Design a protein around this ligand. Structure first.
Ligand code: LMT
Ligand code: LMT
Ligand code: LMT
Ligand code: LMT
Ligand code: LMT
Ligand code: LMT
Ligand code: LMT
Ligand code: LMT
Ligand code: LMT
Ligand code: FMN
Ligand code: RBF
Ligand code: SF4
Ligand code: SF4
Ligand code: SF4
Ligand code: SF4
Ligand code: FES
Lengths: 213, 349, 71, 113, 189, 476, 194
């Protein structure tokens, strides 16, 4: 079933939690949940489009120059994405900054374009890209929410100005009247949170295996 | 199961070493506690008790034997963190520092003997980064039973809860004051002539941390530790010599901008870090040349970030950097074996 | 340089002895000292072989041979 | 336009260079990977009738003996490959695990710290 | 002066602890010291070459023709090709040399650092010399951090880390603490 | 010369003053003796006698099968009753091949082959005379003395060192053997100096034995080149590698023998045994042991025949005045736990310590704090903490790099460890695992070579026979 | 043949370049409009709408002085009579230079000061920003007439402006920048004063 890939890529093979890929945007643009959600959505869109293009162009890539071709097929698309969200989502573009342009070198994107998109049809590749993007977005949302709560208390902030007023319902506040721990926002707060998330994933995987046993 | 030798052992133990280190720290801690009054006592007690409780909880979680709580490895960390904090600091600063050290810095790596970074300095850096306002408020010396220091319940309201410290009970120290007055286009000489006395600063009559103030009782404790074979003289000697040499050279080159020698030695937590904190066995080289390199690096980094950096004191940062650099020093400066050259090849005769 | 083996099931013995080139099985066994290890060895009665083939006492032996005394 | 021509020139130059280099001269995760009881024979005193089948099927020089009623016995060179098990019509070979002796004694690892 | 710029790039603005660039191979290969050293040398050379090529391409082709938005694609494309050559040329000319640079070279074809550094240097408007020095300094900082982290992880491998934290999670926590330690160099240069 | 300074070392409680007062005692003949056939290093000797034979004091019961071995002589006249399994002085407690001799009680000497003017013959004759005596180097290493002397003769020896610096705590056998028999030791040193053409002998004793120093100086004052030296009171000082450094000043190269620096080391008991064998022809039959500890009524030094059960020695010194906790065969720093009191006394047995509870330390292992007190005490200048870390993780190959090859298992590691860690136990376990792997590889190589040779010879024989048969049928 | 690889790479590059140029010609005007709108939004926080009629970011007249160097004065003329001038100032703080914006009216009264770029220590001297504290709103009616050259300092130096608890260098820098801006406006009359 084609839907197997979409569910399998969520937790069994996570880009940032299992394969140890896409760590730069995971650790950099995570100080707010909205930043993580926007980066995840952009990465998912780029992954879907690049996977579809590569699979449609599968039987045309020379074996020895495979990278500089496919990288181009990614790079230009990424450029377009920038030239989209710099024009109609400028508030989010100013926040992400360099890492919206740094999706060409995203290890997850090229890894999925090479490993799966060169030996699968267009529909399975699209579903695999969607699953990887969804998993990356979930990880980004979780880490951003944890860091934002530890640093300021609020969960999701300035979503109306960034993602549009339509998402205004997402602005919730946790721990009212809280100055927050400043270290969570800072770079030292990202590695520790990611390590704790990895440890929690290992613990829940072991407990789930025991329950299945 | 058969027993393996040897069947003889000296009179040594981790408990004795840790308790002797605490005994060496005792006189300077008493001098600090008496000088600043009740709030310092409250903060020190809270920090030590919280460190012990968190260590017990972490030992319970990991399943390690509770006897590990009786070796004094947690009480020493709490003691050093408490004497590193500002005197009239709130309780939550000490509790959070103890939680961040005993916890992430030590017990998250396995326990005693496994951590690669100094726990007390890790907690100090984390507290300074997270809460800069509470970690840059120094109380002037208000001696216990001096008719001007706050009473018992007034000190309780100062430490616990959030009663303001009023006015006239908080001032600037030496290093920060010198840097600020340098930013006020005043040369380095006039600042020290009318705002710094070496004799009073050496005794410990200046504002600062809880136990950092006195540079003489700490020296006595360090010397006593050295005579007891508990620490090695290489690290303290190297740190002090490097700081003094660099400071004296800078003073000689440009006396109107650099202050060096006695001013650098009798200011900040240089002596305490050199004797009791940079000599951490688990996070220091096990060789002799390694210890010399560790001390030289600590001294150079301390002086460089003191003078040209953005901090009035960087003993914790230098210690953390050298703890990071320690494994390479250990793996590249191993002692020579018997019957082999430095490269390890067998000798020829 | 040869070896002498006693195939006694109770205690399988094997010894290595250096002998002069062109020697005989009799002199090789005498030099090897297997007689003193087991006084119940009859060199005229029990079978003497090389690598599993019955041989003669004064037959010449080469380097790397294996004399064996068995029932 | 003057820009697409230059980009195409750069592209074809790079491609031809790569091709000529290949003539004359995956994934990140997989590339990281590249960068980074014995038994012995046993012969009883009755099941061996000197049928010399065990020596016949024993590539190692383990069984010593020939003829009949000589009670061939193994040596230390046995490996338990079993070439002599089915060889004997009377099922004489009695492969057993090696017994612990003084010369094969090693110290035990300390429990824990 | 240039020594101060190089030291500020190496310590004050480290490309990993305060830049978050090239973290995947950094966290994947730092388990062993020798691959860490090899990848450090390879990435230093690759970053220097890529910075030089990117500056030449931007200031001689892109800007004069008026097209700047293309830069990203052009940059990465050129870099990719260069890396391939630097592999194949060193996979026959010197077979012995294909054990310290050639093996780890494919790891940095798309690293986010060989592309992050040129893009950052573009915004500051560096000249050719400044761009080359910026690339080399970023490579040196990456190399030093990788070597230190490799030593730390090699020592932690033989320690009694709890079974729920041994491996990658303890590496991430150690990297966070190392960044906290490096935070003291801020404002020095 | 002038004493150098060795690196590292500890100062354990000597405990030598409670037993080095009484003279060397004597033992009544026990009923039966258990003589293991392997009391030495190298190959195991093969018995020459059968069950029920009558032997005399000095008969050669077992003879060496190869060059590196030592024969076994009958301690006393009697009848052989078993050639079978006997208990062994090992921590494991397993049995070993050995003879059982029932002491007749007459104690009649055999017709010994005495020499004539030992300072007249070539060194090789004296070397083989020592070879046919059972001298085994009563120093702990139990290496045959004949092989050592023969290897020394081929090289150039500039100094013969007598290792009289008894260093183990609780042990005083060398002290009395030098106090009472100084003349014999001096004569043996002179005989060794004649065997190995050398310059002088440098007999060394620790400074905590003033009586031994005075007696040795009084005995050797007229012979000239003989010298008596007073080495410091350090534990790892009796070791050959450390004593050579202390006396000569050089260091024995790694993976090399002591003859490289031109110095031969012999124990003070081995020298006496060599003197006895050369002068009178008496083989190595009895030695001197020390019975000490808080559990013994009267600690003493006993002249014990080889193969005497431990229980006889314990009963001789009054008896067990209390309850023991660990019975050690040797010094506390290198002793082995005796399984029972029925174990015999091999030539390598040095002591019979019976340690009480207040003499044995109580320990509680804790994680290493990296205090680096092991590095400051290791005589070989190693890093014991790293070796223990690599041995605990089963990385023996990485442990060998840090100095596991050069470790002598002296025990200075665990003696100065704040957090009590069995570092020596880890090192012994790692060395045992390495030896097991090496033995497996050696057996694999040997069996592969044997299979290749057997297959080649069988194939060539079959081909030759087939060719001969083909030639025969052609002429038919 | 090698021709296929080169042709493939060339075709990919050409198609991508064509698509990128189409996207750029589609979106560059919108990007420029967004940047201009962001600049206007930044300007509007210090200059109320009623005061100015013409476009402030169209009549920028760079002026040159003896201390600040070169400025970027934007007028806020209503019908030709200057009512306000907006410029920027830079001064060394603690963690680096601070860049702020001033909106001085035609009579010397400050209409509002905002800090654009700073690198002060968060949690200790971040109150200069208008989104966390009202301190930066102190300069709202002051001038060089009702405040002599004695109250334009922090209270540590004998002035009338409050200093942050545990931070004085940053208020010193901000007050010095404000005073220098007012003095610069006073020096250059007519064009900047009216
Ligand atoms: C995935 C790779 C990139 C491909 C991107 C695909 C998504 C692109 C979505 C483009 C959206 C088109 O929708 C675009 O909306 C903007 C909103 O400012 C409109 O722009 C509008 O700006 C202002 C504000 O309302 C109006 O005064 C103006 O008249 C109008 O042009 C455009 O007229 C319309 O073209
Ligand atoms: C799956 C989505 C992934 C997002 C990233 C991919 C780029 C997509 C670009 C095309 C987006 C068009 O998005 C649509 O545009 C309109 C204008 O027409 C935006 O409309 C709004 O955007 C901005 C966001 O800061 C608001 O501040 C502003 O008030 C308004 O212009 C909405 O956000 C959305 O309804
Ligand atoms: C290892 C030992 C750990 C010891 C842990 C002890 C924890 C409890 C400390 C004593 C209780 C403090 O209880 C705390 O009081 C504060 C202040 O009144 C209140 O806290 C409330 O106000 C404070 C700010 O003033 C903010 O955290 C927040 O707005 C809200 O939580 C709550 O009531 C409770 O968060
Ligand atoms: C909201 C919570 C988020 C948690 C985030 C961090 C994850 C931390 C969980 C892993 C922590 C490891 O800490 C501890 O590890 C030990 C391994 O010795 C596990 O195991 C321990 O407890 C279990 C019972 O539960 C015992 O059977 C076991 O012998 C003991 O070792 C513990 O269950 C875990 O608590
Ligand atoms: C073991 C208990 C827990 C100890 C740790 C927590 C202590 C918390 C202290 C909170 C202090 C509240 O603030 C403090 O309250 C105490 C009573 O509590 C007041 O104390 C008042 O009552 C006490 C008796 O109860 C009188 O003796 C005193 O003269 C009077 O001032 C102080 O005037 C006020 O400063
Ligand atoms: C970063 C490394 C260390 C991590 C430490 C773990 C976090 C420790 C708590 C950090 C909380 C910071 O937020 C801090 O919350 C405390 C409550 O504790 C508030 O404190 C408030 O309530 C407490 C009682 O609960 C009163 O004693 C205090 O006078 C009052 O201000 C502070 O006003 C606020 O600054
Ligand atoms: C056994 C260990 C030693 C135990 C000693 C305990 C007693 C310690 C008492 C000395 C500490 C306080 O004693 C003294 O107090 C006065 C106020 O009167 C402080 O203040 C004094 O010196 C400072 C200099 O900076 C100035 O403010 C001023 O000259 C004066 O007030 C001194 O800095 C402190 O030295
Ligand atoms: C600590 C162990 C290493 C010791 C190494 C010693 C090497 C150098 C020895 C010569 C040092 C001369 O050091 C010199 O001493 C003078 C006093 O005479 C000190 O100078 C001192 O007095 C001057 C005014 O007279 C003050 O402004 C100054 O702040 C104070 O330090 C300086 O520190 C240095 O200028
Ligand atoms: C491992 C050993 C390393 C030794 C390092 C030796 C090099 C460092 C000392 C020389 C640099 C001195 O650096 C000098 O000091 C100041 C702070 O005082 C630095 O820093 C200054 O400028 C920077 C950049 O605007 C800002 O952070 C701020 O304005 C200020 O801190 C300057 O860049 C330089 O003027
Ligand atoms: C830990 C240790 C302790 C030793 N103790 C002694 C000792 O007490 N007396 C001694 O003569 N040699 C001692 N030695 C050295 C050897 O036991 C022995 O002298 C040498 O290896 C061979 O000597 P031999 O041939 O005389 O037996 C010791 C060696 C080591 C490693
Ligand atoms: C001489 C000495 C110095 C020590 N210094 C420190 C220190 O600076 N910080 C700390 O947390 N523990 C210190 N300790 C306690 C112990 O070394 C520390 O818990 C190790 O980090 C245990 O992991 C010290 C112990 C000794 C014996
Ligand atoms: S095959 Fe069996 S019966 Fe025949 S010789 Fe071998 S053991 Fe004896
Ligand atoms: S098992 Fe194999 S090696 Fe062993 S005796 Fe039988 S045939 Fe020979
Ligand atoms: S036992 Fe080995 S490692 Fe330990 S001190 Fe002795 S020689 Fe050194
Ligand atoms: S003596 Fe023990 S605690 Fe000290 S370094 Fe050696 S093994 Fe570690
Ligand atoms: S290195 Fe993998 S995404 Fe940056």
């Amino acid at each position: 079933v084609p839907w197997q890939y979409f569910t399998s890529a969520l937790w069994q093979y996570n880009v940032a939690l299992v394969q140890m890929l896409a760590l730069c945007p995971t650790l950099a643009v995570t100080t707010t949940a909205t930043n993580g959600l926007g980066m995840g959505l952009a990465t998912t869109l780029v992954l879907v489009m690049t996977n579809a293009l590569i699979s449609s162009m599968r039987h045309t890539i020379s074996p020895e120059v495979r990278n500089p071709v496919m990288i181009g097929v990614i790079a230009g698309v990424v450029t377009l994405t920038d030239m989209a969200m710099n024009a109609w989502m400028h508030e989010l573009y100013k926040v992400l900054g360099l890492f919206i342009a740094l999706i060409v070198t995203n290890c997850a994107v090229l890894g999925r374009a090479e490993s799966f998109c060169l030996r699968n049809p267009v529909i399975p590749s699209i579903l695999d890209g969607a699953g990887m993007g969804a998993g990356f977005t979930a990880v980004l949302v979780v880490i951003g929410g944890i860091r934002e709560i530890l640093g300021s208390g609020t969960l999701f902030s300035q979503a109306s100005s960034l993602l549009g007023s339509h998402f205004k319902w997402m602005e919730i506040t946790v721990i009212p009247d809280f100055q927050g721990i400043l270290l969570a926002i800072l770079p030292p707060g990202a590695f520790i949170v990611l390590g704790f998330l990895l440890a929690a994933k290992r613990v829940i995987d072991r407990k789930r295996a025991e329950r299945r046993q | 199961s058969v027993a393996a030798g040897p069947f003889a052992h000296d009179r040594s133990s981790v408990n004795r070493i840790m308790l002797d280190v605490c005994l060496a720290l005792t006189p300077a801690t008493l001098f600090g506690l008496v000088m600043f009054g009740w709030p310092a006592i409250n903060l020190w007690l809270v920090t030590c008790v919280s460190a012990l409780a968190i260590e017990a909880a972490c030992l319970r979680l990991l399943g390690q034997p509770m006897r590990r709580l009786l070796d004094g490895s947690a009480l020493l960390t709490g003691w050093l963190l408490a004497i590193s904090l500002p005197p009239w600091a709130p309780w939550w600063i000490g509790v959070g520092g103890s939680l961040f050290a005993i916890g992430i810095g030590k017990q998250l790596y396995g326990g005693i003997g496994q951590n690669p970074f100094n726990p007390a300095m890790l907690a100090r850096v984390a507290l300074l980064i997270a809460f800069p306002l509470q970690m840059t408020t120094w109380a002037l010396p208000h001696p216990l039973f001096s008719s001007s220091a706050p009473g018992f319940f007034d000190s309780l309201a100062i430490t616990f809860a959030g009663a303001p410290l009023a006015d006239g009970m908080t001032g600037a120290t030496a290093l920060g004051n010198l840097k600020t007055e340098l930013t006020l286009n005043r040369t380095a000489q006039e600042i020290l002539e009318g705002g710094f006395s070496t004799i009073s600063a050496l005794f410990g009559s200046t504002p600062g941390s809880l136990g950092e103030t006195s540079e003489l009782l700490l020296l006595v404790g360090g010397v006593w530790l050295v005579l007891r074979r508990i620490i090695h003289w290489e690290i303290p000697v190297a740190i002090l010599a490097s700081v003094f040499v660099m400071a004296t050279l800078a003073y000689l080159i440009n006396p109107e901008r650099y202050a060096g020698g006695l001013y650098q030695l009798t200011s900040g937590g240089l002596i305490l870090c050199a004797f009791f904190i940079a000599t951490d066995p688990v996070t220091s080289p096990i060789s002799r040349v390694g210890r010399l390199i560790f001390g030289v690096g600590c001294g150079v980094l301390i002086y460089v970030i003191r003078t040209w950096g953005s901090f009035p004191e960087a003993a914790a940062f230098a210690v953390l950097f050298m703890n990071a650099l320690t494994p390479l020093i250990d793996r590249y400066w191993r002692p020579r074996a018997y019957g082999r050259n430095v490269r390890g090849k067998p000798l020829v005769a | 340089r040869v070896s002498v083996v006693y195939a006694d099931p109770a205690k399988p013995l094997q010894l290595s002895c250096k002998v002069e080139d062109g020697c005989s099985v009799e002199q090789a066994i005498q030099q090897s000292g297997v007689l003193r290890c087991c006084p119940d060895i009859d060199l005229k009665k029990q079978k003497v072989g090389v690598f599993g083939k019955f041989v003669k006492l004064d037959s010449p032996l080469k380097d790397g041979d294996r004399i064996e005394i068995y029932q | 336009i003057e820009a697409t021509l230059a980009l195409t020139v750069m592209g074809v130059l790079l491609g031809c260079g790569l091709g000529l280099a290949a003539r004359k001269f995956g994934g990140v995760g997989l590339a990281e990977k590249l960068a980074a009881a014995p038994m012995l024979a046993r012969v009883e005193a009755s099941q061996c009738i000197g049928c010399t089948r065990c020596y016949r099927a024993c590539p190692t020089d383990a069984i010593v003996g020939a003829s009949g009623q000589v009670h061939v016995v193994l040596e230390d060179a046995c490996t338990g490959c079993g070439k002599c098990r089915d060889a004997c019509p009377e099922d004489c070979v009695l492969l057993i695990p090696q017994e612990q002796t003084l010369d094969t004694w090693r110290w035990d690892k300390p429990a824990a710290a | 002066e240039y020594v101060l710029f190089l030291l500020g790039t190496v310590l004050v603005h480290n490309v990993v602890l305060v830049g978050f660039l090239g973290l995947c191979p950094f966290m994947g290969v730092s388990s062993k010291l020798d691959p860490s050293i090899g990848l450090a040398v390879a990435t230093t050379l690759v970053m220097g070459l890529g910075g030089a090529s990117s500056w030449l391409l931007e200031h001689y082709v892109l800007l004069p023709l008026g097209i700047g938005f293309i830069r990203i694609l052009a940059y990465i494309v050129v870099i990719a090709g260069m890396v391939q050559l630097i592999e194949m040329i060193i996979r026959k000319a010197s077979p012995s040399l294909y054990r310290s640079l050639g093996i780890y070279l494919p790891l940095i074809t798309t690293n986010c650092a060989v592309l992050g550094v040129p893009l950052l240097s573009v915004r500051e408007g560096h000249d050719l010399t400044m761009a080359v020095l910026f690339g080399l300094g970023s490579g040196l900082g990456f190399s030093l951090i990788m070597i230190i982290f490799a030593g730390l992880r090699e020592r932690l491998a033989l320690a009694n880390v709890p079974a729920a934290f041994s491996g990658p999670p303890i590496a991430f926590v150690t990297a966070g603490l190392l960044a906290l330690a490096f935070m003291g160099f801020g404002g020095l240069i | 010369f002038n004493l150098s300074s060795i690196r590292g070392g500890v100062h354990p409680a000597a405990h030598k003053d409670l037993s080095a007062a009484l003279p060397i005692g004597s033992l009544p003949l026990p009923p039966r003796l258990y003589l293991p056939l392997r009391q030495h290093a190298g190959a195991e000797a093969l018995p020459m006698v059968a069950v029920g034979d009558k032997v005399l004091k000095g008969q050669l019961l077992a003879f060496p099968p190869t060059e590196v071995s030592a024969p076994v002589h009958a301690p006393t006249s009697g009848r052989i009753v078993a050639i079978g399994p006997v208990p062994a002085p090992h921590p494991s407690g397993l049995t070993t091949t050995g003879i059982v001799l029932e002491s007749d009680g007459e104690d009649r000497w055999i017709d010994l082959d005495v020499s004539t003017d030992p300072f007249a013959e070539d060194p090789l004759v004296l070397a083989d005379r020592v070879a046919k005596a059972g001298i085994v180097g009563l120093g702990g290493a139990i290496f045959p003395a004949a092989v050592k002397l023969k290897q020394g003769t081929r090289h150039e020896i500039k100094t013969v060192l007598v290792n009289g610096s008894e260093c183990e705590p609780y042990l005083t056998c060398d002290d009395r053997i030098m106090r009472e028999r100084a003349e014999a030791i001096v004569d043996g040193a002179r005989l060794i100096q004649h065997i190995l053409r050398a310059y002088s002998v440098v007999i060394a004793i620790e400074d905590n034995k003033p009586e031994a120093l005075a007696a040795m100086r009084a005995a050797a004052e007229h012979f000239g080149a003989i010298e008596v030296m007073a080495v410091p009171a350090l534990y790892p000082m009796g070791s050959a590698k450390q004593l050579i450094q202390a006396v000569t000043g050089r260091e024995v190269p790694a993976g090399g023998r002591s003859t490289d620096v031109g110095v031969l080391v012999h124990n003070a008991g081995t020298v006496y045994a060599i003197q006895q064998a050369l002068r009178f022809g008496r083989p190595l039959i009895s030695r001197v042991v020390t019975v000490s500890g808080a559990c013994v009524k009267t600690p003493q030094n006993l002249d014990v025949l080889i193969g005497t059960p431990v229980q006889a020695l314990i009963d001789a010194c009054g008896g067990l005045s209390g309850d023991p906790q660990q019975l050690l065969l040797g010094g506390p720093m290198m002793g082995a736990v005796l399984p029972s009191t029925e174990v015999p006394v091999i030539k390598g047995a040095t002591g019979l310590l019976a340690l009480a509870r207040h003499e044995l330390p109580n320990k509680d292992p804790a994680p290493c704090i990296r205090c680096a007190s092991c590095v400051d005490a290791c005589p070989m200048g190693l890093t014991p903490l790293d070796m223990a870390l690599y041995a605990r993780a089963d990385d023996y190959d990485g442990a060998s790099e840090y100095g596991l090859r050069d470790c002598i298992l002296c025990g200075c590691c665990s003696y100065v460890c704040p957090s009590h860690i069995p570092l020596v136990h880890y090192f012994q376990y790692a060395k045992g695992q390495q030896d097991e792997r090496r033995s497996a590889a050696r057996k694999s190589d040997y069996i592969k070579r044997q299979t290749e040779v057997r297959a080649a010879r069988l194939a060539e024989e079959e081909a030759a026979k087939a060719a001969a048969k083909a030639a025969k049928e052609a002429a038919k | 043949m090698v021709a296929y690889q080169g042709l493939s790479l060339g075709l990919v590059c050409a198609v991508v370049a064509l698509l990128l140029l189409t996207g750029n010609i589609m979106t560059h005007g919108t990007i420029a409009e967004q940047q201009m709108q962001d600049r206007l939004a930044t300007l509007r926080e210090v200059l109320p709408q009623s005061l100015y009629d013409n476009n402030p970011l169209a009549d920028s007249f760079k002026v040159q002085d003896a201390e600040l160097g070169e400025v970027e004065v934007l007028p806020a003329r209503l019908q030709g009579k200057l009512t306000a001038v907006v410029f920027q100032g830079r001064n060394i703080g603690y963690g680096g230079p601070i860049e702020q914006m001033m909106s001085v009216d035609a009579q010397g009264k400050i209409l509002g000061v905002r800090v654009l770029t700073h690198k002060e220590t968060p949690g200790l001297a971040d109150k200069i920003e208008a989104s966390r504290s009202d301190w930066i709103k102190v300069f709202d009616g002051l001038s060089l007439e009702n405040t002599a050259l004695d109250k334009w300092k922090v209270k540590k130096d004998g002035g009338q402006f409050d200093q942050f608890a545990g931070a004085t260098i940053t208020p010193r820098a901000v007050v010095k920048t404000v005073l220098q801006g007012l003095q610069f406006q006073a020096r250059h009359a007519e064009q900047l004063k009216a």
